[PDB]
Amino acid sequence: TQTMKGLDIQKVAGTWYSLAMAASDISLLDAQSAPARVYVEELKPTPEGDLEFLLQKWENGECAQKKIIAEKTKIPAVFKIDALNENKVLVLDTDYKKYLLFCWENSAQSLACQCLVRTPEVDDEALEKFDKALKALPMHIRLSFNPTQLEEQCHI
Amino acid sequence: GLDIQKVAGTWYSLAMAASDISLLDAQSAPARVYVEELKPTPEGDLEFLLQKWENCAQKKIIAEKTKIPAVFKIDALNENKVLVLDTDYKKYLLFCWENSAEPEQSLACQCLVRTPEVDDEALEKFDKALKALPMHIRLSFNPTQLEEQCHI
Ligand SMILES: CNCCCN1c2ccccc2CCc2ccccc21
Ligand SMILES: CNCCCN1c2ccccc2CCc2ccccc21
Ligand SMILES: CNCCCN1c2ccccc2CCc2ccccc21
Ligand SMILES: [Cl-]
Ligand SMILES: [Cl-]
Numbered sequence: 001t002q003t004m005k006g007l008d009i010q011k012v013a014g015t016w017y018s019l020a021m022a023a024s025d026i027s028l029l030d031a032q033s034a035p036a037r038v039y040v041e042e043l044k045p046t047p048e049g050d051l052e053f054l055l056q057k058w059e060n061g062e063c064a065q066k067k068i069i070a071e072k073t074k075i076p077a078v079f080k081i082d083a084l085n086e087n088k089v090l091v092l093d094t095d096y097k098k099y100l101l102f103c104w105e106n107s108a109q110s111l112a113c114q115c116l117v118r119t120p121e122v123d124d125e126a127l128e129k130f131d132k133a134l135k136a137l138p139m140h141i142r143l144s145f146n147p148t149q150l151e152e153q154c155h156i
Numbered sequence: 157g158l159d160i161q162k163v164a165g166t167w168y169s170l171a172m173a174a175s176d177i178s179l180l181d182a183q184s185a186p187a188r189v190y191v192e193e194l195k196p197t198p199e200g201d202l203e204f205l206l207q208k209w210e211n212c213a214q215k216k217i218i219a220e221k222t223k224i225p226a227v228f229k230i231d232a233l234n235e236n237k238v239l240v241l242d243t244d245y246k247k248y249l250l251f252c253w254e255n256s257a258e259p260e261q262s263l264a265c266q267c268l269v270r271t272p273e274v275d276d277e278a279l280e281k282f283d284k285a286l287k288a289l290p291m292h293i294r295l296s297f298n299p300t301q302l303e304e305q306c307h308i
Contacts, residue, residue, distance in 0.1 A: 026295055026308065030181045142294045143177055 001103060001111070001137065003077030003090045009045035011096040016040050016116040018155065019099075020127060020144040022134050023112040029141045032058045032154075036104060036112035038066075039155055043100075048072065051079055051089065056154050063154035092133045099126035101133050111137060120150035158226040160196040162245040167191045167268040168302045170248075171279055173286050173294040175263040180293045183209035183306070187253065187264035190306055194249075202228055202238070212306035241285050246270060248278035250285050263289060272302035 018039040023029045028036040042054035049072040056063050070079030070089040077091040086108045094100040103113040115130035117123050127144070134142075149155040169190040174180045179187035192214075193205035200221040207214055219228030219238040230236040235257045243249040252265040267282035269275045279296060286294065301308040 030295070032181070140296050140298070144292050146292070 001090055001105060002092075003075060004093050005077075007077040007091050007094070008096075009043075009049065009051050009076075012043045012051070012091075012094055012100055013045055014118065015042050016100065016118060017120045017150040018114050018145065019117045019123065019150065020115040020130055020142065021112065022130075022137075022139040022142040024110050024138050024140060026141045028110065028112050029143055033060075040114060040116050041065075049076075053089075058154045063156075093129060099123060099129065101130055103137075111139070113137070113139070117150075121147055158240055158243070159245070160194075160200060160202055163194050163202070163240075163243055163249055164196050165270075166193060167249065167270065168272045169266055169297065170269045170275060170302065171267040171282050171294065171296040173265045173282075173289070173291040175261070175290055175292060177293045179262060179264050180295060183308070187262075189215070191266065191268050192305075204238070207306045209306040241265070242281060248275060248281065250282055252289075263291070265289065265291070267296075269302075273299050274302075 021029055021036070023036050028034055031037065037058065039056040040053055041056055044052040044054070046052065051070045053068045053070060055066045055068060057066060068081055070081050073080055079089040081087045081089060086106055088105045090103040090105055092101040092103060098118055100116040101113065102116070103111055105111050113134060115126050117126055145155050172180055172187065174187050179185055182188065189206045189208045191204060192207055195203040195205065197203065202219040204217045204219060205214065206217065217230055219230055222229055226240040228238040230238060235255055237254045239252045239254060241250040241252060247270055249268040250265065251268070252263055255262040265286060267278050269278050297308060
């Protein structure tokens with residue numbers, strides 16, 4: 001999987017909306033509580049060059065919040081979220097002001113990718129770039145949300 | 157010009173899409189149904205032999221001919237319709253279930269193939285057909301899932 005060249009995480013700070021999601025395996029996304037069914041609410045880069053994700057997930061009939069620190073690696077668009085080097089975040093592309101494409105990758109190989117947007121509206125341009133970035137990846141499920149869903153906890 | 161006699165026989169559900177996530181987001185979901193066989197009737201109706209995951213249950217639904225070619229009605233209330241979008245008879249068939257009952261119209265589309273193998277050409281024609289439709293969930297199966305019927 002190829003990641004963005006020249007990513008500056010200081011420009012991705014702020015609140016985001018998970019507009020669309022895709023995964024390598026149906027069971028990663030299909031259920032409300034599926035493992036990769038996570039909604040990005042905020043990106044917070046640190047001065048050290050780590051990227052904190054504020055996530056929401058449906059768990060046991062409620063929306064739960066989770067913070068995940070993705071630690072910098074030698075690749076500016078590749079972040080590690082465990083000490084075993086099994087789980088990574090890959091930033092595929094961003095224009096900073098409208099959309100950001102990224103993937104969770106597990107090489108224990110499982111992949112779950114998202115199209116984030118800055119404003120809770122459908123962005124057909126961001127959706128086209130998402131589909132173009134996924135073309136070479138072995139996705140078996142895609143989901144997309146409406147503007148009403150983007151503004152509710154856990155996209156209810 | 158759809159020829160229902162040539163779509164007869166064995167099929168496999170390769171991919172599925174729907175207008176609403178909750179139509180396809182579980183094995184239990186209402187549109188999560190796998191086509192096993194199409195049987196044309198002498199009167200020009202199309203019987204769909206389906207399997208649905210419960211707790212694999214078989215279901216037969218008769219799609220009756222209408223005055224519009226490749227459009228079939230399932231009920232007498234004209235609420236549920238089957239649309240045949242495209243086929244080459246020998247490899248793939250694309251179709252959509254539609255329900256136009258209140259308050260919002262539901263749509264659920266499938267790509268069927270003749271053999272339990274992934275067909276990138278059929279999946280590309282399905283993807284192209286879905287581009288103009290307001291789908292919010294799409295799924296494709298691997299050859300293992302193709303052979304194991306309702307079990308994925
Ligand atoms: C398989 N690892 C944990 C399962 C969920 N997970 C995924 C899913 C697909 C690919 C990679 C990952 C990595 C970790 C992660 C982080 C946040 C949400 C889901 C996931
Ligand atoms: C492996 N590439 C499949 C391409 C088409 N495909 C997509 C597209 C984007 C994201 C996920 C998927 C997987 C399932 C699917 C189902 C139906 C039509 C297209 C697609
Ligand atoms: C609303 N009908 C409930 C059963 C699900 N169903 C769907 C789903 C979405 C859109 C249309 C339809 C038409 C009827 C039908 C027939 C066979 C399987 C599922 C469905
Ligand atoms: Cl770089
Ligand atoms: Cl989708």
